[PDB]
Structures are given as structure tokens and as C-alpha cells.
Paper text:
Among the best studied TCSs are the nitrate/nitrite-sensing systems NarX-NarL and NarQ-NarP, responsible for the regulation of anaerobic respiration. NarX phosphorylates NarL in the presence of nitrate and dephosphorylates NarL in its absence; NarQ phosphorylates both NarL and NarP in the presence of nitrate or nitrite and dephosphorylates both proteins in the absence of ligands. Both NarQ and NarX consist of seven domains: a four-helical periplasmic sensor domain, TM bundle, HAMP domain, so-called signaling helix, GAF-like domain, dimerization and histidine phosphotransfer domain, and, finally, catalytic kinase domain. Whereas the sequence identity between NarQ and NarX is ~28%, their ligand binding sites—membrane-proximal parts of the sensor domain’s helices H1 called P boxes—are very well conserved: 14 out of 15 amino acids (residues 42–56 in NarQ) are identical, and the differing ones, Ile45 in NarQ and Lys49 in NarX, are responsible for the differentiation between nitrate and nitrite.
Previous studies of NarX showed that replacing the arginine residue (Arg54, corresponding to Arg50 in NarQ) that coordinates the bound nitrate with lysine or serine resulted in loss of ligand sensitivity and locking of the receptor in the phosphatase state. We obtained the crystals of the R50S mutant of the sensor-TM-HAMP fragment of NarQ using the in meso approach, similarly to our previous work on the wild type protein and its R50K mutant. The crystals diffracted to ~2.0 Å, however the diffraction was anisotropic, and the final dataset was processed to the resolution of 3.3, 2.4, and 2.2 Å along the reciprocal lattice vectors. The crystals belonged to the same space group as the ligand-bound symmetric WT protein, F222. We solved the phase problem using molecular replacement with the structure of the ligand-bound WT sensor-TM-HAMP fragment as a search model. Surprisingly, the backbone of the R50S mutant has the same structure as the ligand-bound WT fragment, despite the Arg→Ser mutation and absence of nitrate in the ligand-binding site. In particular, there is a break in the α-helical structure between TM1 and the helix H1 of the sensor domain, whereas TM2 and the sensor domain helix H4 form a continuous α-helix. A hydrogen bond between Ser50 and Asp133 is observed in the crystal structure of the R50S mutant but not in the MD simulations. MD simulations of the sensor-TM-HAMP fragment of the R50S mutant of NarQ reveal a fast transition to the ligand-free-like conformations, with all of its characteristic features such as diagonal scissoring and formation of a continuous α-helix between H1 and TM1. We conclude that the crystal structure of the R50S is partially artefactual, and the protein is trapped in the ligand-bound-like conformation by crystallization conditions or crystal contacts.
Residue numbers in the entry:
A (entry chain A), B (entry chain A): 1 to 227
The structure:
Amino acid sequence: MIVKRPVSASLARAFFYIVLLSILSTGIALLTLASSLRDAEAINIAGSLSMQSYRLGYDLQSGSPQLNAHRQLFQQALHSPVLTNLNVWYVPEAVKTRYAHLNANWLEMNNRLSKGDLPWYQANINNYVNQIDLFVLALQHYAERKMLLVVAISLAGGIGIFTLVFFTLRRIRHQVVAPLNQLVTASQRIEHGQFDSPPLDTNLPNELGLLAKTFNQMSSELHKLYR
Amino acid sequence: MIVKRPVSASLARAFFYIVLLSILSTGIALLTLASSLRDAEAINIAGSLSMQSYRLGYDLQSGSPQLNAHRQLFQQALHSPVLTNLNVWYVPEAVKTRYAHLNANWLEMNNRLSKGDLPWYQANINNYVNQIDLFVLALQHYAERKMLLVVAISLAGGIGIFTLVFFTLRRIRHQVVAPLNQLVTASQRIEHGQFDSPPLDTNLPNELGLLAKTFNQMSSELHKLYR
């Protein structure tokens, strides 16, 4: 007789998938989360462009001496590390295309401000800032989709591990634990002149199926000897 | 003889902790994530207050007919659902205390704007908006701490499940799989007149420790009979 389906191989497999599913879930989540750590910063800084843009016009109307320093504070913000890092493959094209528009708009805005053209500012500042808000809204939606992705993965991971464990434990109980108990009981009985108990089920394709067959034959011979 | 440590109870326990750790991790993460879904929105809207505040001053300087509609657009934003939901127990006191300051500042700002007091606006708008930025920065840091919490949990969860599985599989192999193989080999040997092989180790406190003892006695008697 032979064991066609060893428990060692079955168990190895069962646990492998439990881990795999854990590593996968955890991995995607951590990779997503890692890409998101500075989302709130990006949205903050991006949003500040809106305010800086209207401040500039307020500076211009009031002849503020801070105009030039504010024009340089915008440029630094616009080209901040957090925003320049947006030009990366996993960031949606829309977010990158809008950022490029903002950079082009600034060149005209900053030029007009150097000439002190107030009438042009008053005629364009609404549209100018609208494009900035649509960029902030883009970052917001992007940050939301990524967080939702983590929720889906976290949920499927947990549900997936709960499901695997259920069936894995259900298989071990049916194919190992229960039969083992039947072997122990039969063994304890045979050891005490109890020989007329239901023979052991031998239909399992694993080690316990073989043990049952050997026991059914080590037992049946005794009963006959005595008996 | 008896089984002092059944495999059924040992396994139940092992898998229980694997699930528990999965449910716990997943649960805290999903609860944190659920509280964070609108973080990016809050930061966006909060940041827009900064811009709306300077626009109002720009309106005032240019005698814009939109002044009153913008004064009403700020109030709606300031009291938006996303910001009013901040007054909840799990939100840090700082974020709630700053929001309360913004609401008080608005009452004075909106009043001065109704009187058309430009000189007061010019003298206060810097400080006014600074408090708004510190509120946005507070929301940003809050959103960052919560995301980091999810990273810690996700990491510990994955590492925790990988660790549990390792030792759980290592215990089953040492206490079930290996001995089972020894029982099968001995059984296959005894079945073919091989009687001088090393007796089975009987030191396990589980079912297999008992089976070994019964086998060592069902075997030893045969060898003597024949042999």
C-alpha cells in the first residue's frame, strides 16, 4: 500500500496560500500607502497657490512692498518637492497635465505682475484660480481612489484569510484529527479485549488511510487468535 | 494511557490566533481608514478658506459686486459638512480648538466687511489667514498620523501572520507530520517481516504519542511470536 496524498504536502500548500495572500494584501497596501504619505501635504500646498494668487492681486491693488517677495514665494511653492514629485509614472496623466498648465499660466501671470498690469489681472484672475482649484480637486480625487484601494485590499485580505483558515481547519479536522481519534479509540479498545467495534474507514488518501488499513489487519488477526 | 494534549485543541488554538490577529489588524485599519476617507476633502475645503479670505479683500479694494455673494460662499464653506464633522471625539482637541477660533474670527471679519472697513482688513488679514493655515496644517498632520497608524498595523499584521504560520507549521510538522511518517514506515516494515528497526519515540503528549506506545506493543509481541 502507499500514501497517494501525503499530509505534509497538503499542509505545506494550505499554509503557503494563507501567507501568500497575507504578503500580497499587505504588500499592495504598503506600496499604495507609501505612495500616499504626502497626499495631504500636496493638497495643502497646492491649495495655498489659490490664496497666494489672490494675495498677489491684493498686493498689486494696495502697492504692497511685499509684492516681489510674494511672487518669489509662489514660485517656490509651485515648484515645491511635493509637487515636482507628481511627474512620476503611477500618477494619473490628468494630475500631471493640469500641473503643467499651472506652470505655463504662472509665466504669463508673473510677467504681467512685473509690468504692474492690474486690468489684465482683474480680467484673468478668476479663470487663473479656477484652473488651480481643478488641480487641487484632482489631487483630492486621486488621494481618495488610492485610499479606497487600500480599503478594498484590507477587506479582501481579512475576508480571504478568514476563508482560507476556515476550509483549511475543516480539512485537517476531517482528514487528520477525526481519524486520529478513531485510531486512538480503536487502539485503546483493542488493548482491552474489545474486538467487535466498527472497522476503521480506510477511504482517506493520506497517511491515516494507510494506518487504518494496517490497524484493521493487526486487529482482525488478534480477534481471531483469541476468538 | 491517555492523551494529555489533544491535537484538536492545539490546532484550534493556533488557527484562532491567526484569525484573531487578522481580524484585529484588518479591523483597526478599516476603522482608521473609514475615519480618513474625507481627510483630503477637509484639507482642500479648509485651504480654500485662505483664498476666499484674500479674494474678499480683493473684492473690497475693487468694489466688486460679488462681495456679498463671496461673503456667503465663505460662510457656507466654513460651515461645510466635512468641517462640522470635525467636532467628534476621535478628532484631536487642537483641530477642534483651531476651527472654533476660525469661526470666531469670521464673525469679526464678516462684520468689518459689512461696514467696508478696508484699513482694518489691511491691518488684520495677515494674522487672520495665518490662523487658517495653521488649521489646515493641523488637519494635514492629523491625516498623516492616521495613515502612519495604518502602515504600522498593516506591517505588524503581515509580520504577525507570517510569524504565527511559521511556528504553527513548525509545530504540526514536529508533533504530527513527522511521527505519522514514522508510524507509516514502521507499519509498512512490520507488515513485511522487518522487526529490528528503532522503536518509535513515545514522548509526545498528543495522539501520536499514544499510537506509538500501542504500536511498540503490537509490534514487540509479533517479533517474539515469530522470532
